[PDB]
Enzyme design. Structure first.
Site, PDB file in Angstrom:
ATOM      1  N   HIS A 171      37.585  59.535  11.675  1.00  0.00           N
ATOM      2  CA  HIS A 171      37.279  60.642  12.184  1.00  0.00           C
ATOM      3  C   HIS A 171      38.046  62.035  12.590  1.00  0.00           C
ATOM      4  O   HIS A 171      37.620  63.220  12.974  1.00  0.00           O
ATOM      5  CB  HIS A 171      36.924  60.072  13.976  1.00  0.00           C
ATOM      6  CG  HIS A 171      36.029  59.028  13.923  1.00  0.00           C
ATOM      7  ND1 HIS A 171      34.774  59.028  13.397  1.00  0.00           N
ATOM      8  CD2 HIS A 171      36.260  57.777  14.391  1.00  0.00           C
ATOM      9  CE1 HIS A 171      34.156  57.776  13.493  1.00  0.00           C
ATOM     10  NE2 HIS A 171      35.085  57.047  14.042  1.00  0.00           N
ATOM     11  N   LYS A 230      29.515  53.713   3.773  1.00  0.00           N
ATOM     12  CA  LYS A 230      29.484  53.709   5.400  1.00  0.00           C
ATOM     13  C   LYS A 230      28.110  54.764   5.488  1.00  0.00           C
ATOM     14  O   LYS A 230      28.168  55.900   5.053  1.00  0.00           O
ATOM     15  CB  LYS A 230      30.385  54.348   5.981  1.00  0.00           C
ATOM     16  CG  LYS A 230      30.772  53.991   7.539  1.00  0.00           C
ATOM     17  CD  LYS A 230      31.967  54.356   8.261  1.00  0.00           C
ATOM     18  CE  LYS A 230      31.939  54.168   9.701  1.00  0.00           C
ATOM     19  NZ  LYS A 230      32.069  55.320  10.449  1.00  0.00           N
ATOM     20  N   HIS A 273      37.132  54.375  19.559  1.00  0.00           N
ATOM     21  CA  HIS A 273      35.778  54.374  19.178  1.00  0.00           C
ATOM     22  C   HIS A 273      34.951  55.624  19.177  1.00  0.00           C
ATOM     23  O   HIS A 273      35.164  56.253  20.113  1.00  0.00           O
ATOM     24  CB  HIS A 273      34.838  53.368  19.495  1.00  0.00           C
ATOM     25  CG  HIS A 273      33.653  53.068  19.166  1.00  0.00           C
ATOM     26  ND1 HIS A 273      33.318  52.916  17.817  1.00  0.00           N
ATOM     27  CD2 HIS A 273      32.451  53.223  19.957  1.00  0.00           C
ATOM     28  CE1 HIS A 273      31.915  53.112  17.619  1.00  0.00           C
ATOM     29  NE2 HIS A 273      31.158  53.209  18.787  1.00  0.00           N
TER      30      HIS A 273
END
Ligand SMILES: [Cl-]
Ligand SMILES: [Cl-]
Length: 124
Positions: free
Chosen positions: A12, A41, A119
């Site tokens: 990210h 993904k 996450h």
């Protein structure tokens, strides 16, 4: 194996650009970060802020996670983000993504010591 913190960074963080500048940003980054290696993904978000600003979110507004967990935190301010999602015309190994740039609050789940993001939950 990759630690949870390192995997979050790899998937990210993109502190080198202020925002996606082209419709091909997702295609290039998903590849560069090795997210299209075994499969495409399906969805992934990149955050265009410094690592320190993202880690600081773990000290911001504590909110519930969709799954009911309580280690989620929402950033007090909006951040520059790019959402990458496969299109219908995407088939591994020819992965194809739609790039959508936006400025929004991020929600992350934190853990560990030090307590950092593990996450990417969502954006608001
Ligand atoms: Cl890798
Ligand atoms: Cl994501």
């Amino acid at each position: 194996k990759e630690t949870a913190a390192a995997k979050f960074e790899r998937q990210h963080m993109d502190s080198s650009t202020s925002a996606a500048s082209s419709s091909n940003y997702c295609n290039q980054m998903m590849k560069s970060r090795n997210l299209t290696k075994d499969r495409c993904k399906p969805v992934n978000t990149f955050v265009h802020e410094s690592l320190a600003d993202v880690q600081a979110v773990c000290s911001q507004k504590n909110v519930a996670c969709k799954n009911g967990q309580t280690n989620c935190y929402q950033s007090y301010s909006t951040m520059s983000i790019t959402d990458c999602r496969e299109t219908g015309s995407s088939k591994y190994p020819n992965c194809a993504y739609k790039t959508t740039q936006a400025n929004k609050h991020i929600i992350v789940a934190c853990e560990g010591n030090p307590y950092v993001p593990v996450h990417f939950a969502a954006s608001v």
